[PDB]
Structures are given as C-alpha cells and as structure tokens.
Design a binder for these strands. Sequence first.
RNA 1: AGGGGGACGGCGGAGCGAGCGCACGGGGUCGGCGGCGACGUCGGCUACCCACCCGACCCGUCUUGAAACACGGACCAAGGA
RNA 2: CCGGCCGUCGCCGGCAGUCGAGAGUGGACGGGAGCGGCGGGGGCGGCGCGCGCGCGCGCCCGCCCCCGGAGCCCCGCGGACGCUACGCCGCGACGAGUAGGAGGGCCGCUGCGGUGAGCCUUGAAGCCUAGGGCGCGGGCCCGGGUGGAGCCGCCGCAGGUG
Lengths: 187, 125, 225, 53, 147, 106, 128
Amino acid sequence: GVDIRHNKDRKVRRKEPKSQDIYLRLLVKLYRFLARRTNSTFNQVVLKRLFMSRTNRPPLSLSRMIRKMKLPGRENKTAVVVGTITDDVRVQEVPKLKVCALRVTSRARSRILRAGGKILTFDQLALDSPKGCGTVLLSGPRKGREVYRHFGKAPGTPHSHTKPYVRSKGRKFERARGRRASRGYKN
Amino acid sequence: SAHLQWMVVRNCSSFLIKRNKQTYSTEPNNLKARNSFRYNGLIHRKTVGVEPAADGKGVVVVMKRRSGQRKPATSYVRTTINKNARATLSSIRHMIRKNKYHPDLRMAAIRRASAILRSQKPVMV
Amino acid sequence: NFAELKIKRLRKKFAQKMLRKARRKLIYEKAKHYHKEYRQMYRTEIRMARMARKAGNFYVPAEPKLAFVIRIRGINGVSPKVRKVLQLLRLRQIFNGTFVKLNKASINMLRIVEPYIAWGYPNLKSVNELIYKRGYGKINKKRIALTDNTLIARSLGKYNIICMEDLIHEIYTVGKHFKEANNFLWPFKLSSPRGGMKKKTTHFVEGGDAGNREDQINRLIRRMN
Amino acid sequence: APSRNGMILKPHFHKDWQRRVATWFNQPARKIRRRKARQARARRIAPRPAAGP
Amino acid sequence: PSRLRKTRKLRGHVSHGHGRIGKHRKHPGGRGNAGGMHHHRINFDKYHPGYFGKVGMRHYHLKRNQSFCPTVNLDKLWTLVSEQTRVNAAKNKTGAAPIIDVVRSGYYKVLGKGKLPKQPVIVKAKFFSRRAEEKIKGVGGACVLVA
Amino acid sequence: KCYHGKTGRVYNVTQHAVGIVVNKQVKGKILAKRINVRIEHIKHSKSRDSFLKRVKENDQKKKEAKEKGTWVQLKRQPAPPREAHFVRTNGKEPELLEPIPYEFMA
Amino acid sequence: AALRPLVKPKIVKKRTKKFIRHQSDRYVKIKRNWRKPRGIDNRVRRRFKGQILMPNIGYGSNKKTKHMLPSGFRKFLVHNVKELEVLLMCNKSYCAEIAHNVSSKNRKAIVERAAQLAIRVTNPNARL
RNA sequence: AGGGGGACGGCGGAGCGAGCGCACGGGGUCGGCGGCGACGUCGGCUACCCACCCGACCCGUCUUGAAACACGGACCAAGGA
RNA sequence: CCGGCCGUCGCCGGCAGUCGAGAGUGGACGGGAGCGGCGGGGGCGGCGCGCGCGCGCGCCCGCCCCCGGAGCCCCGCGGACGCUACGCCGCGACGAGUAGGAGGGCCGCUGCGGUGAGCCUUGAAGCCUAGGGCGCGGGCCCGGGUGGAGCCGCCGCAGGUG
C-alpha cells in the first residue's frame, strides 16, 4: 500500500455538469466538438462556462457592456456574454454595437436593433467564426448578489463590515449592546 | 429539426421498450431496431424502411420524399421488389449507392432485406 | 494533378525514411562513443591506482556522486520527518529504489531516514539492468513502458537525450541535466529479494541491513530484480 | 440552539393552535356562491343599475 | 417529493445520522433560542453583534404615513415621461424645456445621484436635496415645488 | 515573551519606538501580527545584509560576464563530494594504532 | 445442432454461488437475502477470517459477458409477435423468453413464428 | 577557393535505376496437427438437496474494552418508528 | 513483482468514422523553367538521400469518377459493434473502514397522469417448489404443479414504502 492521501482524489469541477433543457444541452453538443478539435482557448473557456449555474452566470448589465466596449482598440468586434443582457435605465445614449449572448431581455433587444447593431445566438456566432476571431468576451459581475454582504468575518468581530441577518432594520433590533460603547462594548 | 425532434423523443417512451439491459424501438421505417438515433424513420428527412411484403413474396422498400411539407399521409413512397435474392440485393444497393439517399444505411438495408427473404422462403431450418 | 500529388506524397514518405536512417546512424555512433568513454574512464582509475602504489604513496578516489537508495521498512507507523523525507525522495511504498545525486545536502537528508533505506554505490551494470528492464518514464503524469526510443527523445529532447544509452550515460556520469533526466524516471519498482534479507531492521554494520553499503547494492539489485 | 441566524416565531400555544383554521377549500365554492348570488339579484332588479347607487 | 429525501435512502443504517454516542435526544440545550446570556453567549454575541439592551426614544404610535416620502435619483429622473417627449431636444413643439411631475408619477423627494443629460428640464416635487438641485440648475433646468 | 527571538519586517516609525510585523505561532494557523516596540529591544539582523552583499557580487559578476563573453557559474552551488587526490607519504610508513588496555581510575 | 451464437467465448465467473446473510441459517425469521451488517461487534463486517464473505465490487464479471447465458446468448423477454420482430436483425446474440403469462393459443404462434425468424427460444415447448 | 589523395553540405556541382524472402529474440497464439467413447451412458465452479474429510466463540447495544460471570433476545406471521 | 478481471479517479483524454512513436500549408499566373526534395554532420549533438522518376490512371485517356470510387495498402462525400453523444473507445494510478456525508440503483412496495391496437377462463394475482438460469448485490426471469379474476413493462408523477 502506497502512502498517498486520498482526500483530494476527485476534482469537484465537474466535467459534463448540470445540463437539463435541450437548447442549452444541444449548444453543448455543438461546442464540445469545437473545444476538442480547435486550439482556440476561447472555445475552451466559453464551453467551460456553458456548464455553470445561473448564480455563476450573472446578467451582463448593458451599461457595463457599453462602458467596457467603448475602451480603445475594441472597434467593430462582437462582444460575447455567456449570461444574459438586461437593459439599463442609467444610460440614455442609444447603443452602437453588436453582441452575442444566450438570452437578451426584450427592452435591450429593442434598443440594440434600434441602434442598428445585431443580436447573435451562439450557433450564429459559431458559424460566423469557428473560434475567437476579433471577439471580446465579458461577464456580468459575479460578486453582485446580496448574500455576499452577509458572508465574511462574522459580525461582532472587531473589524468586520458584514451584514447580519435581522428581520427588519429598526432601532431596537441588534443595535443594543456590542454596538455602542454606551451599552457595554462596541465591535 | 432533425436533432430537436430527437432530443425530445429519445427517452419519452414512444415506441421505446427497455428490459433485460437493452433498448429497442418499434417504429416503422426503421432498420436494425436497437440504436435510437440514426435509426429512426420519424425524425430524419432521409429515411429508408425495409418491410416484408404483406403477400409473402419479396420485400417492400419505402422512402421518405423531400417533395411537399411534412404531411404524413403522402410522404412515404413504396416500391415492391420480387426477384431472386442476388438481384434483389443488387437493386437495393443500386437504389441507395447511386442515389446518395442515405449511404450510411446501405448495408443495414441489405442485411434486413436478405433476412426477410430467408424468413420467407420455406425451409426446415 | 494526381500523379504529381503522388510524387509529393512519395517525397514526404521518403522524407521520414531519410530522417529515420539519419537518426539511427547517430544513435549507433553515439552508443559506440559511450562504450569507448566507459572503458577509458574505468581503465583510468586502475592506472592511477597502479601508479600511486608503485610511487609508494596511497591513492584515494573521489568518493562517488551517485547512489542508489531503496526503501526496506514498511509504511505503518512511520515518524513525520521520515515520512516527508521519503515523500521527497519519491520512494513511497516498500521496496522502491531511486537514484540520488550525492552532495552535502543529500547526505544529511538520507541520514535522518537512516533505518528505512538500504543504499549504496551502483555499478554501471547495475544501472544498465535497472533502466533497461524496469525503467518506465513519466509522460503527462501517465507512467508508460520504455518500449521504443522516441518516448525518451521527446520527453528529454531539450537536453539532447534521445537514446536509451545516452539516458543511462547521464545517470551514471551525472551531467548538467541529471536532475530532470532523473525526475523523468518513475521510481523503480523492485521485487522482494530472492534468498534472504538478513535481519532487515538493523544497520548494515551491525550485521543487519540498512544504511551505507558503498558496494553491496551491486549484490542486492541482482537479487531484487 | 443556533448556528447562523436569530429569528423567533409565534406559532406555539402549548395547548394546541391546531384547533384553528385549515379550511380554505371553500374558496372556489364560495366564489361560485357569491357570483351566483349576484347573477340572481341583478336578474331580480333588472333595469336598475348593476352596482346600484 | 419524498421519494428523494435523505431518510427514504438512509433506511438501513441504525440511526439516521445523529450518531450513536450522543443520540438525537429531544431538546438538548433549551427550547428555542434560549440561553443567550448563559451558555449560547458565544454564538449570540459573535453572530449577532448585539441582541440584549435597548436604544431610546420610545414612540407610542407611528402611523407610517407621516413619513411616506419615497424618492428617485436624477440618473433615474428622465424615465418618468415617455421617450418621445425627450426625443424633442428643440423640435416639434418643444421649446426650452418640458416639465416632469414627480408627485404625479408617485415619487415625492428627488434625490441626487449620477450624471444628468445636458438638456434643460423642469422638475416638480415636494422635496429637493442640495446636490439634487445644484446639478439640476447647472444643467440648465429649474426646480419647482408643490404642497 | 512570545516574540522574544522572532524577527520580522518593520513598517511604522514613531519618535522612539517602531512597529514590527512578526509571525506568531498559534493553533495550527500562523498569524502575521503587528506590534510596537521601544527601539531598545530591536536590532538589525545580518540575515538579509549578507544576502544583499552576495547580490552585489552576483550583479558585478554578471556585468563582468557581459564584458568577457564567458558565462561563469552564478552563486551557491551546494557542497559537492570530495575529489580524487594523491596523498604523499614521503616521511615515514604510517603509524600503528592499537587499543588501550583497561585500567581503573576511580 | 439447432442454433448457434455469433461468438461463444469461455466465461469465467468468480462465484455467484449465492451470497447468504450472516445468520441466515440459525433462525428462520431471517431469509437468505443479503444485508450488510452494520454492527460494532459483528464478525462478518469486521472481516474475520473463515467467516461468511461479503460482496465487494471486485466479484463482478467482465463486461464482455454479462448476462451471457451459459448456452450462449443474452436473455430477452417477449409478449407477442409484434414484440418478437424487434430481434430480426439482431438475432445472433439474443434469445426470446416468452413470459409466464402468455396462453397456449398465442404461445404456439409465438414459438412457430420465432422458428421462422431463426431466433432460438429459451422456452421451447412448454404447454400443450 | 583549384583539383589529384582526402572532411562533402548539397539531395543534383555523383550515389534510386526494381522485387522477392528470411522473417523477426519484430507493435499481447496459433497450428494450413492428430487420439478416444457414443442408446443407457455423457454433460450440469453452476445449482441447489443429502453425506464425508483437511481449516473457523452469538447476535443487537452502551463502552477505552464484549463471547463475557453486562444487558434484551424461546419460536413464526402481520403492524412498527 | 508479472499477468487476467471489476470498479473509482485522473487524462484541457480520442471519436461528427484516430493527417506522429517529430510522418510536417495551399491555391494561380509571369518570367526564368528541376541529373525526384527544402545547399541544417568532420554538428560527430531534438531533425536532412537512395525500389528514386512502378496504383489502374484521368480532356481521343469508360468518368479532375463530380465517391462504374481520390486505388489518401496512416481514405472526415463516405456509415464497421461504432455516434442509445446521458453514447463508444484509448492510457495510467489506486481500492481498508464504525460515527458521519454523498453518488448511483432497467433494486423493491402502493396510488395517479401518460404510453404498450400489452398479458389474461386455451387460466391473473398470490402459494409452494431437491426444476432451469441471470446479477457482486438490492433482487429478477423461465418450468412444474396448486387457484379462480385480474395483472404487468416503459416516461413522468405522489407516499402512512423496505
């Protein structure tokens, strides 16, 4: 018997993971071939994302897309999103560009086509270019959801800045002791 | 399309039968029953079925036609065949090879038709 | 047209024949040169011995650079230092054997795992038999059997190590690429010795079998194969 | 006996709270009843406006 | 469904978890969130930084309608009229500036956040804020109050 | 006394006492803790200074290799095994050495 | 010389000589079905030598011959003619097994038509 | 550098001029070898029924520790968390 | 230690019918136009010759076969058992386990929406069985009797389910 230790035998980054509705499953059955037989690391990463769960593919907000596609050197390039695109009302300037995302919200689609860009579904993209050829790739922010302000150092430690779970925000809920040196001690 | 209406009917029990660690499908227009894709008659636009002729002589070979939309009443054309075994097999190999219909079914069709003819011609074996 | 692409295909095929013949010529010649090398470096030590003794003074060699290390004690209950040291030498289960660069660091590394090893100075026959018979490379973390020679050539090309004889040559004549050429070899998996293992839980000089030998690994490998 | 949260809830009278409602399976039947009653009275006082005053 | 739960699979093994040494007793360690000051002190005061004590100004009846002032930032102001009204910067019966009745649209106090378009406008509301009006009057708009 | 002997970087400098970052051992984690120490308890540590000196000689040697075209060996090859040398014995034949018989000195 | 398989390779099972339950022999309120004994004194789980074996996945049979009937086929279970055709092309490694629930008036037709198809039947003449 | 003698890139400032075999201590065995018995004897690591002989404490649970001179357990069905 | 076997893990593994044990772009013309290459060995050192210019053979040369097939005897128009892609295949490494966690069960019981132009008085469920067999196992299939009217397979669904 060897003396290796086994607790890291199996890599949890699963290989053919959760893939449940036929459209996404068929997209995978398509890009799997490209990932095997094309050195384009871009296809490796795109396919590796087509497995992730929705909490790991947050929605690419269109204002973010605009201010990340405006940057120099990135003219006439398709900007590709693995999540989905939700339009923003923080932006008044009609868009200018050409996307390629899984699902795009109706408002954002209206405004893109009004802008005169294009919408590309991943089949359209693959037949357009069998690999990354002048394609920028983005992602909506993934430290965005609420529960991250709950995570971290447990509140009550000297220098956390995390959000406890309380059922309101009133003055009487947690702010009693351990919060103000007028009531015993502060964090 | 040919793959959409395959991902939809692949385990939704339609003609599917599973028992004793095997899968078979009973749909018409099907060569060797087992495999459940590349071996349907329902889901493909280019399908060839080989049946024993109901009258006990020769085979009947049916092909899907691209003519007209998918109206099942008239989209399968039937061609009887009643010859010696060698000539019959030569005719089916013609009908497939020389037509570019569905080359990947030439030999499956040939073996099924030959098995049909064996089943028909009276014998003690 | 087709005859011309036939010509080009025949050109390509002759290209591989061309190349393979050149390769085999080079392998054969380098092997002959290594033969002459080993013979010269053997006779040289004998010559120095004779000349010193005739001079009436004493000849002391350069105590060796290469040792062969085998693990002999079990896996159960080992102490933590010796656990990690065996892990570092990458001999793990019982009866594993590796080659070792000798220097001030490695000696003291072997001293703290004293009673778990039987180690000594291999002779070139004892290296030749090992590598030829139970030498498996480590390609893509996927041990394979050194059947052909292209395996070695590819996994050590950057060091100009393209043939079995040259691969043995570095290990016996430790060269400026020995560390990689010897990470390339899987631990040698020797069988339990024939004959006996006179008491195995005791240093060699105590009549047992562990620690420095400097010669007797030559004995022990002929059996543990 | 917690590990992460601190939230406390009402439903505990040690003499049971079971003895109060579960029945809302009326809901469709009650909808039918009230709708039928409106049909009835709107038929009975025909010309007068539906919702009355 | 219950044909998927843990127990309907953890049927054979002697106890569904809960070990065999410290068995799944009824209520070990008080009912509910008891203790708090005696033996769950650790949890209650390192996962809820304060739960014991009080903070003043008891207020004996808060009809939550004398403080119903919902708000909207400038960077969300221009979405209360249609896009068409704004379409007209100077054209099609659109002079210097239109008017947006924030109370009519449901929001009372117009806060200030972000960058507002360089296009004169008129805002109507009950409550403005210092930045919310410095930006509005810098753009070339004007602010108007109601009740 | 937990920090008596440990040694770590210095990051704050007051009038007459410096802050120090040192690694305190605790249960199996290792903490990078920060403290204040009046300057009478600290002193330099030649550990880094020797490394800096040998850095200077390495870089000078690299420059001199630039000048002469020859690639010498840069620092610290570890201690190798002994070489084969001739021991001249002119002067006598070696001394005969033999064990001492037992004696009692209480 | 009735029917032959496509290939009839030698099959070497380890042992399916039925595994029995620890103390399926003393009492009779225990049946022969296997049950892995989760105990703290238990010799069988604890793996003492000379004790009733347990099943371990090594004991499996190489997947080149699972279900390979010793007569040289894979089994298959049939109900009637419309489910006997599904073996026409694949009739050299799969033998029909007409079920316990058919009746003579159909079982005779099944057997006789199978004979036309040349598919050996695990249940030749059964009822009369 | 010339070119006789010679280190020849070169693949033309020369070396194919076109197959058959062994093979083969050559990328995991084949024979293009034969023998005996067959209507009351042959086959059945399965596949279980009985009998033999070489080799092996009674389960469930607390327990650091169970075969325990620790406790529940006569036996079967059905219910049982 | 050498080999056979099961499984698990790894291989960014291979496969839309494996362009390597370094096997190595292409499409046209123009000029000038090959005694088969692409002027890397006395490098003595991944990587530079000797059936080369012998596969029928290519618009009158059936047919740049546009598969009467590129004779690509290392053939993606082009399917071998292949490709039930949740499938098939290749290489290596390891397999102890109470408490506990998880995955997978064409393992099991009952009930429901679907589906087998399912089975059934020419005999259902159960019962018994030194009868035949499958699966490591959960259990399952087949023969014999016994009985008298019902039952089961597959996809989903639910539970007072072992």
